[PDB]
Ligand binder design. Structure first.
Ligand SMILES: Nc1nc2c(ncn2[C@@H]2O[C@H](COP(=O)(O)OP(=O)(O)OP(=O)(O)O)[C@@H](O)[C@H]2O)c(=O)[nH]1
Ligand SMILES: Nc1nc2c(ncn2[C@@H]2O[C@H](COP(=O)(O)OP(=O)(O)OP(=O)(O)O)[C@@H](O)[C@H]2O)c(=O)[nH]1
Ligand SMILES: Nc1nc2c(ncn2[C@@H]2O[C@H](COP(=O)(O)OP(=O)(O)OP(=O)(O)O)[C@@H](O)[C@H]2O)c(=O)[nH]1
Ligand SMILES: Nc1nc2c(ncn2[C@@H]2O[C@H](COP(=O)(O)OP(=O)(O)OP(=O)(O)O)[C@@H](O)[C@H]2O)c(=O)[nH]1
Ligand SMILES: Nc1ncnc2c1ncn2[C@@H]1O[C@H](COP(=O)(O)OP(=O)(O)OP(=O)(O)O)[C@@H](O)[C@H]1O
Ligand SMILES: Nc1ncnc2c1ncn2[C@@H]1O[C@H](COP(=O)(O)OP(=O)(O)OP(=O)(O)O)[C@@H](O)[C@H]1O
Ligand SMILES: O=c1[nH]cnc2c1ncn2[C@@H]1O[C@H](COP(=O)(O)O)[C@@H](O)[C@H]1O
Ligand SMILES: O=c1[nH]cnc2c1ncn2[C@@H]1O[C@H](COP(=O)(O)O)[C@@H](O)[C@H]1O
Ligand SMILES: O=c1[nH]cnc2c1ncn2[C@@H]1O[C@H](COP(=O)(O)O)[C@@H](O)[C@H]1O
Lengths: 491, 491, 244
């Protein structure tokens, strides 16, 4: 009949202990009754935002600009766009993420019939797309007079300069349309049946109110996980500081349509951060705030009291970071995640485990310890979507990976540095790499016997999930060992 | 007035000498009267094939399958598909290169109205495209009854299994068509004006004779340099051996539509190779033959007498090669290229400089010494289009790079190994990397004062082009030296 | 426009910065300067042959910069096949340019004060240093550490990181150099080294050194690679290279 109890509960693992890292422990295997592919990875980012994937790209200038944030959101994670740039640059990166996928396009590029083929080529150069509805004024609210696309300007070579759009358009008599007040699903069925690539939406006065594009329905079927708002735009996060000038940056990011703000700090338990959370929650009540760089429940209390919608957890972990060796201050990250999540769950506040995520097994550990999402810096650095360009050193394709408190960065791009300006080897695309992390998380949960990240956390808090501590020699034994050379071909 | 003569002519450089490599000499700078961008790189591959770029991907299993050959041809070079594979696999790689861009598609995928949406999706799965004309037989020469594309099957969810194409097609009453005997230029005008993505070509009996696709006109404007045959398909090369069973491989490659054959040997001056050249030139008189890895004029004579249309130059150079330390036999590559090209030019036979090309300066040297084209192995290995998958070893993104006499290749992938089965760090895409090599060749020619590769070779043979020989310490001084670390960020 | 700003800021000499100065573009710029600013000294100059030097001396340059593809940071030879071994270039161009009274600057590949004495002996009137003065205190930018070593950046002006306004081909490689201290101590060390080189040679000045070289009084010996080993630091376990 009976079998004895084996391993520690999480409450036991952190009680009789020094601060553990992810490397200091294993999760004991459970019972498998399900397929890894059926493991649900649905994740709370904040009180009101849910992601289909637990994964976040960190707000760093060598990790997250618009290409990373688009790719993360398409993979069912999110990106937070970094703030080591002008307020206007950051708002433009946010605008790029929000424009990439659209339901109703309500603020399209529009031209007059008095504009020219060269104005459509300049529009395509400046905004990326050729499909431009034509209205009497060349402003959105006028009577629809036609539609111009790349197939209409295709191979009209050097006629750019003075060819008026009127003779180039598909004229309004010829175009398929939907009435205003059509639902997105009804407009999609009209567009799908029409076999056209645009469907203009016009009111009873025959003037343009929105347009929809077939490329968004293609993006729909291409990206089943994608993190979208109610109007089917990709979710975007952005960082801001807690200085007075961050109020201007915050206003630019909110009119760019940012969904969630992260307050970027080494040590978020401050009068400056509590003041910024209160300022945001009064001025932009719709806006989700991750106020958050904490490692203790005492810090978490003050930000949850200030009204944060999520917390970022970690201090002095993080591959690029030297905060612990400069300020003495921080915590071992597994202990921090467990302590802060066990407290913050009482208030319904989700936890982001930030920094020190070197492997997909560290992601599964962070999630098992009570994180609702995991934020990666270096693990996503030197992907193709990460900012900047590759170079070669001793014989190796490398990309920069900076740290936002490195004294390269800061400098308006005595000053105390908290980071160290690294290099990282090439990883390829986020659109292949994040599906690998997803499958790794799913197989980790499967070996543990958890059908979802929600049941994984419930097994952890009930004490059904068992842990074993590792000696240093268990960390050697659990790594690659005894070989001459090896080829770590992940995915 | 007068200025004294400075440096050696090529004839002097190779006369009073040991065998020189590309590293052993420099070209002296000339006069610049032109922009590097106006340097013409037009190159003879063989007696009848001219490329817009001097660049060739080598027939190796870690370098050239169809993705590399497509990318090389699009960049105005060519790829030779390797032969360390079944005859049927190699011919299917050649078929993929020949199908990627089309003028008239005269052998399209066709279906019957009695086929289904599921048959169109399965056709798209096999061949990569959804644009399928419908004929009442579902075979090419028959009455056109409609056209089906991805916009016709788009967002039909699970209706695949039994929905007949008849009710899915654009019917023949609605479709824009051109008459048979229309020129490609005339069909392109009809297609461009129609704003459609296909244009079927039909005879007076209203049965399908060809089709054309707008995506080929897009590929036209996207790829100005592309190496195309008369019917606008990409040029493809293939390797073959000189064994009796290579006659079967050659028949498969010729019906797959290969444009040029390279006879793959370490030492091409053999009765076996001369017999294979004679066999090809009698059985396939249209087919271009590059014979001969040769390094002497005496070897070149026998293959030019056999009737080769081009020669490969190199023996025992090549990053992967160990022929010299296994057979004692070969030549320093700069000397070999100069000697063989100075002989072969008398017969109008172009030279491929093959192997030992580590840098774009080595390309400019090979071209200056009389090569009409340059073939690269390792320089194109670990591009994205190179066969196989990336791995990590020393914290470095690597791809395998094998060699064809290596002992891992000769297992159908006493045997004597002539190569060494190694690895190369990631390079990114051919479609970015070959424009960098092109621009580097152009700036090399510009510093030399040559407006084209044709005038560069004429300056070399007349003695206008001057060379200086390098000590080992000049090779140190000419490299990166005296630094602690460096970042070789090419392009 | 840049030239007009530099001339009203009071610049004394302009250097025309190119990999390969024997061009219609450079000869046109030399003519433009010599008519618009007749007071202004022009070093039009990145040459390695007498044929290149002729066209710039005919254009009216007041000095030539000599060197191509030498230079610690440089990859021009391995990107363009084009250049010359620097000792040969300096001697060839100086033996020609002295006929016209045009001084030569030997530029790049100067690693040691002995290379300065060789460049001056071979007919250079001045020597230009990049990397030998990089990571002095007066060199632009800030020190960092990597391998437990105090380093300053040293870029190359055809680095793709110098380009991008700090297809676009690179001619240089974005390196690092170890700290050297101040120019105001380091250049007096180079001066003393040049003076002792001249003294061991028996030359009382750089003018007599060049005259001894052109008359054939100054004698040279070629070195095998093993002479370049024997003439270096060799056969020790470790050493401290404490210059000055
Ligand atoms: N035009 C447009 N329609 C969309 C977009 N996203 C979803 N839709 C429409 O809304 C429908 C609902 O899609 P769902 O799959 O249920 O959920 P979703 O999160 O909206 O879309 P997925 O990203 O595919 O999961 C789709 O079938 C489309 O008809 C979009 O970006 N643009
Ligand atoms: N056309 C258009 N697309 C927009 C606009 N704003 C965002 N988008 C998005 O950009 C994408 C447009 O894709 P396509 O419809 O393929 O672009 P296109 O209009 O065909 O233009 P080309 O790709 O240049 O031929 C969709 O995902 C749109 O939602 C806008 O103003 N106009
Ligand atoms: N359908 C089709 N038409 C083509 C193709 N290649 C060229 N054409 C047509 O032939 C014309 C001539 O093109 P050119 O630019 O003169 O020379 P090319 O070598 O054929 O094409 P490029 O590859 O662009 O240089 C183009 O404008 C097209 O109308 C192709 O692959 N398919
Ligand atoms: N459709 C079609 N294209 C072919 C065929 N053989 C080669 N091709 C080439 O494949 C490309 C087809 O491109 P598209 O016209 O964009 O493909 P599509 O038919 O629209 O199908 P989807 O891309 O799946 O929607 C062109 O470059 C064609 O020349 C064939 O049998 N049918
Ligand atoms: N709603 C519409 N009704 C009628 N015609 C339209 C409509 N939308 C676009 N068109 C016209 O249809 C043609 C194709 O445009 P469409 O948006 O469908 O594809 P496209 O994006 O331009 O094609 P492609 O992807 O091949 O580049 C053009 O002539 C365009 O003006
Ligand atoms: N020659 C033609 N005449 C009339 N209709 C056509 C013709 N060729 C294609 N069609 C129809 O036009 C619609 C669009 O097909 P088309 O080839 O032009 O674009 P597509 O490649 O399918 O579009 P997309 O690139 O957006 O996926 C489909 O309904 C198709 O059946
Ligand atoms: O300069 C810095 N000093 C301290 N912490 C930093 C700095 N820059 C970024 N971080 C943190 O490091 C995390 C990324 O760590 P990583 O995933 O281990 O590489 C970020 O999300 C930040 O929390
Ligand atoms: O195994 C081998 N032994 C000898 N030569 C080889 C072998 N495999 C390929 N080569 C040659 O090496 C050339 C590529 O050299 P690379 O460009 O320097 O890497 C090829 O095009 C062949 O001529
Ligand atoms: O990017 C570059 N490519 C080529 N030559 C350069 C570049 N940048 C500087 N140089 C040359 O290198 C010289 C300095 O060489 P160094 O003293 O050996 O370090 C400079 O004075 C220039 O002539």
């Amino acid at each position: 009949g009976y079998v004895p109890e084996d391993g520690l509960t999480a409450q036991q693992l952190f009680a009789s202990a020094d601060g553990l890292t992810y490397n200091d422990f294993l999760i004991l295997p459970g019972f498998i009754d399900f397929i890894a592919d059926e493991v649900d990875l649905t994740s709370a980012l904040t009180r009101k935002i849910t992601l289909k994937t637990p994964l976040i790209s960190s707000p760093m200038d060598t990790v997250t600009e618009a290409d990373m944030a688009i790719a993360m959101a398409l993979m069912g994670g999110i990106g937070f766009i970094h703030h080591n740039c002008t307020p206007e640059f950051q708002a433009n990166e946010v605008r790029k993420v929000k424009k990439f996928e659209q339901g109703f396009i309500t603020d399209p590029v529009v031209l007059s019939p008095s504009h020219t083929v060269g104005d459509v080529l300049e529009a395509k150069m400046r905004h990326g797309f050729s499909g431009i509805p034509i209205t009497e004024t060349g402003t959105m609210g006028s009577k629809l007079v036609g539609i111009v696309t790349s197939r209409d300007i295709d191979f009209l070579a050097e006629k750019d300069h003075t060819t008026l759009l009127s003779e180039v358009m598909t004229p309004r008599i010829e175009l398929v349309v939907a009435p205003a007040g059509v639902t997105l699903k009804e407009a999609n069925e009209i567009l799908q049946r029409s076999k056209k690539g645009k469907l203009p939406i016009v009111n009873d006065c025959d003037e343009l109110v929105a347009i929809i594009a077939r490329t968004d329905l293609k993006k729909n079927r291409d990206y089943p996980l994608a993190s979208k708002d109610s109007q089917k735009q990709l979710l975007c996060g952005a960082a801001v500081g807690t200085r007075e000038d961050d109020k201007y940056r915050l206003d630019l990011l909110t009119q760019a349509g940012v969904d969630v703000i992260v307050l970027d700090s080494s040590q978020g338990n401050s009068v400056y951060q509590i003041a910024m959370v209160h300022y945001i929650k009064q001025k932009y009540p719709h806006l989700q705030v991750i106020g958050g760089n904490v490692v203790t429940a005492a810090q978490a209390k003050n930000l949850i009291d200030a009204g944060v919608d999520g917390l970022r957890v970690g201090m002095g972990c993080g591959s690029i970071c030297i905060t612990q060796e400069v300020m003495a201050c921080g915590r071992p990250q597994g202990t921090a995640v467990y302590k802060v999540a066990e407290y913050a769950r009482r208030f319904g506040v989700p936890i982001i485990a930030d920094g020190g995520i070197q492997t997909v097994g560290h992601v599964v550990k962070a999630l098992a310890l009570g994180a609702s999402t995991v934020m990666m810096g270096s693990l996503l650095a030197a992907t193709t979507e990460a900012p900047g360009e590759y170079f070669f050193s001793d014989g190796v394709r490398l990309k920069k990976y900076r740290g936002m408190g490195s004294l390269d960065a800061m400098e308006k791009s005595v000053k105390i540095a908290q980071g160290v300006s690294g290099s990282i080897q090439d990883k390829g695309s986020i659109q292949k790499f994040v599906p690998y992390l997803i499958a790794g998380i799913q197989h980790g949960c499967q070996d543990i016997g958890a059908r979802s990240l929600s049941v994984l956390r419930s097994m952890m808090y009930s004490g059904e999930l068992k842990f074993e501590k590792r000696t240093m020699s268990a960390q050697i034994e659990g790594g690659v060992h005894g070989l001459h050379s090896y080829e770590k071909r992940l995915y």
